[PDB]
């Protein structure tokens, strides 16, 4: 007891130091940043908030524990008050209550008592200015607390957060409206909480009404104030409207627009993966392979760990339907390895045309595919592999006989081979002529693609791609 | 309360007069509760379950009357019944085949996109269960063989039920593919070899092919002359548009500049 | 052994000599781009260091 008793006091000062100065330096700094300039936004503290919340989402959040009583939530949410420069006294009173945890017997004011606490910035009379700071006070205590996931009676407090922070949404739409620049700072905060909206519902029931409530904030951001706001709302749509039926696939046509400009960076990179799985159910491979490839190369920085790895797993799924794929272990990660083992040997059976090997993969590894929901392709991927097998042979040989390729690709009969080659010509896969007597297939080398034709015509898209980046560099140069 | 409603479900209808009378009786249901959005008190959705079964047989009456717009009307309604925000509903009977009626009718019109999206009501359990859904997904598998042969062998035994009308349209959409698929391009295919797929004995369909295709009618054989066909060069004209490509290409070099 | 530049014909029996197919502009292009791959990758260290 004396050994562990003396080690209890030291830690809580650590949240009283860094976690204090988290919203003391940033929040007190963003005060003057959100009072003016306010260009854009920027307000880089809102993006610095991405380097805090996501950092806090591991440690320490607001809590932890840490061997404290979880008294940081009531501390900053009380006594806002605020006014002219005496707001420093509020930060000074935040230092005064630090000794309360270390001296007296500490008491936990979270949970049940957090209901009037979120009303206090309104009850302090008055805020009087920044809702994003109170939105932060209605989120950063509660939303990182959601990671506990105890599911008992505190989920309605997570809903009470989504209630009183919807009262912040009441102050979001009603207040300002003219050169706000807090909404663009809130578009990062409103995004997050709207993601926590979706997350909290997934543990109880998927949201039917919030789907209607999503289009509310969706449409109302147009055209008055929209920067990055509708994109994050469109991400909420395509995320869940994918996993749940129906008709949401073709919905992307009337929504886009794009919506420009893509923000922020990797945030829009995953969006191409979302519509990527969509366009995969449209059966169009070519537009799906370019949006999936662009989804990996445009996505920084990780780690950790498998969040980027699992999304990359199902990303190369469109490559299984392309018909041209290499062995995917070049994309393997030691952490993703154990999870991709049932999905690994799959593509290894795609490179071969054996039915007994391909069907054995579906039987044993089909259990892993149930969680992915990828069973739509397994019926049409049989027709994809037979195109890869015939392309391997047709590219390796000038002439290929139907009887020799019959059992080599084990089509087993001459009649269905005439049906496959016919549809292969219909799809433009093979140029082979066929001489029908028994019959047999006699092809010839295809040429004249040459030099003067394809490379210089493709270079029209290459330079038009490059000369636009010259403007992209100038536009990016004009901001500094 | 209200009714009589389901009393006409067992006897179906001798003609289309009773089908319109049931639609007229269904109008009183559409005037009060309509199709939505009453959550309740889910007991107010009980007559909707009663409204489903008569809309289920209404789609069976729609294929009996052959009217296309009415057929997709009863299906889209029932499509939104299970799509409704309340997923807990008592099990019905005709729900099985009517999900396949519009499924196979949409395969007859060749659309691939809306085929798989209709099975998305229970996509994970398609291959797992519901043998009624297992037949069309295995039927589309045979269309890629192609079949022709394997489809007609599976056309020997089907539950089905009611697919008899759609498998006749599944014929015509397959029958016109014998001319489209097999060529281009083959050289010459013998008389009875083409008859093996077309079955019959000496039908007027292959006689209509000799007219429509043209192509060739040879003795005891068919020819692709001449030749294989049209002998594409393709063209010496595109040298023109190649100079057109340099126009805007040199202009893009001047835009930088 | 490069001592002889040409190609034979097995069917009709005529040996054809061609010194034609030069390599000039191409290797002078792609090989410089392969080196340019070391310019960006080595600059990726500067990029990620100054930003975070």
């Amino acid at each position: 007891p004396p050994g562990g008793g003396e080690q209890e006091p030291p830690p809580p000062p650590a949240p009283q130091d860094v976690e204090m100065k988290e919203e003391a330096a940033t929040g007190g700094g963003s005060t003057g940043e959100a009072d003016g300039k306010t260009a854009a936004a920027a307000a880089e503290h809102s993006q610095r908030e991405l380097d805090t919340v996501t950092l806090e989402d591991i440690k320490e959040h607001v809590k932890q524990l840490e061997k404290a009583v979880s008294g940081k939530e009531p501390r900053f949410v009380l006594r806002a008050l605020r006014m002219l420069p005496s707001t420093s006294r509020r930060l000074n009173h935040y230092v005064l209550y630090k000794a309360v945890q270390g001296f007296f017997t500490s008491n936990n004011a979270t949970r049940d008592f957090l209901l009037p606490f979120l009303e206090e910035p309104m009850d302090t009379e008055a805020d009087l200015q920044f809702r994003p700071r109170t939105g932060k006070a209605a989120s950063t205590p509660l939303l990182p607390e959601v990671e506990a996931y105890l599911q008992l009676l505190v989920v309605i407090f997570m809903m009470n957060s989504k209630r009183y922070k919807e009262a912040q949404k009441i102050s979001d739409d009603l207040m300002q409206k003219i050169s706000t620049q807090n909404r663009r700072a809130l578009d990062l905060v409103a995004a997050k909480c709207y993601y926590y909206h979706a997350r909290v519902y997934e543990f109880l029931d998927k949201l039917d009404v919030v789907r209607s409530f999503l289009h509310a904030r969706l449409r109302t951001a147009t055209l008055r104030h929209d920067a990055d706001g509708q994109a994050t709302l469109l991400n909420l749509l395509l995320r869940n409207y994918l996993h749940y039926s129906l008709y949401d696939q073709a919905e992307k046509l009337v929504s886009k627009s794009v919506f420009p400009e893509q923000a922020n960076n990797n945030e829009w990179a995953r969006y191409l993966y979302y519509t990527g799985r969509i366009k995969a159910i449209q059966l169009e491979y070519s537009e799906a392979r370019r949006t999936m490839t662009n989804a990996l190369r445009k996505a920084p920085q990780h780690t950790a760990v498998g969040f980027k790895q699992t999304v990359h797993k199902l990303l190369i799924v469109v490559e299984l339907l392309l018909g041209e794929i290499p062995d995917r272990l070049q994309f393997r990660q030691p952490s993703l390895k154990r999870s991709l083992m049932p999905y690994f040997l799959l593509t290894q059976a795609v490179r071969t045309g054996n039915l007994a090997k391909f069907n054995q993969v579906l039987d044993q590894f089909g259990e892993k595919f149930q969680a992915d929901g990828t069973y739509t392709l397994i019926i049409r991927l049989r027709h994809n592999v037979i195109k890869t097998g015939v392309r391997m042979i047709s590219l390796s040989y000038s002439r290929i006989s139907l009887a020799d390729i019959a059992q080599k690709l084990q089509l087993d009969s001459p009649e269905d081979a005439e049906f496959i080659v016919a549809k292969a010509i219909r799809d433009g896969v093979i140029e082979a002529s066929i001489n029908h007597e028994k019959g047999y297939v006699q092809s010839k080398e295809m040429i004249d693609i040459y030099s003067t034709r394809e490379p210089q015509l493709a270079f029209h898209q290459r330079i038009s791609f490059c000369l636009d980046i010259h403007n992209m560099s100038v536009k990016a140069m004009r901001f500094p | 309360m209200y009714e009589q409603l389901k009393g006409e479900w067992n006897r179906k209808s001798p003609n289309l007069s009773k089908c319109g009378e049931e639609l007229g009786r269904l109008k009183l249901v559409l005037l009060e509760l309509n199709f939505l959005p009453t959550t309740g008190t889910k007991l107010t959705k009980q007559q909707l379950i009663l409204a489903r079964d008569i809309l289920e047989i209404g789609a069976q009456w729609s294929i009996l009357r052959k009217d296309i717009p009415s057929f997709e009307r009863y299906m889209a309604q029932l499509k939104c019944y299970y799509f409704d925000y309340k997923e807990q509903l008592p099990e019905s009977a005709y729900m099985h085949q009517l999900l396949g009626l519009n499924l196979l009718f949409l395969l007859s019109q060749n659309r691939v996109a809306e085929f798989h999206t209709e099975l998305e009501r229970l996509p994970a359990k398609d291959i797992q269960t519901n043998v009624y859904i297992k037949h069309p997904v295995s039927l589309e598998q045979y269309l890629m063989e192609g079949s022709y042969n394997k489809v007609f062998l599976a056309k020997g035994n089907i539950p089905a039920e009611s697919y008899t009308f759609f498998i006749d349209i599944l014929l015509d959409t397959i029958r016109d593919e014998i001319a489209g698929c097999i060529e281009k391009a083959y050289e010459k295919i013998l008389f009875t070899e083409a008859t093996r797929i077309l079955f019959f004995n000496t039908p007027k369909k292959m006689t209509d092919y000799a007219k429509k295709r043209g192509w060739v009618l040879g003795p005891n054989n068919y020819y692709s002359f001449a030749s294989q066909q049209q002998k594409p060069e393709d063209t010496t004209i595109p040298s023109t548009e190649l100079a057109k490509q340099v126009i805007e290409y040199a202009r893009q070099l001047e835009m930088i500049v | 052994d490069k001592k002889f530049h040409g190609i034979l014909d097995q069917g009709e029996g005529v040996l054809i000599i061609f010194d034609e197919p030069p390599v000039d502009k191409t290797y002078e292009a792609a090989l410089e781009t392969i080196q340019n791959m070391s310019k960006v990758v080595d600059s990726l260290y500067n990029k990620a260091k100054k930003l975070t």
Binding site: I463, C466, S473, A476 | Y249 | A29, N36, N46
Partner: peptide, 30 residues
Amino acid sequence: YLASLIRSVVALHNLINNKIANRDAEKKEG
């Protein structure tokens, strides 16, 4: 071909070097 080859590397000279010198002054100042 050359117009395609020059504009590719001229960009690599223009695009890279501009981004380098820009962020060196821009972010290190504030």
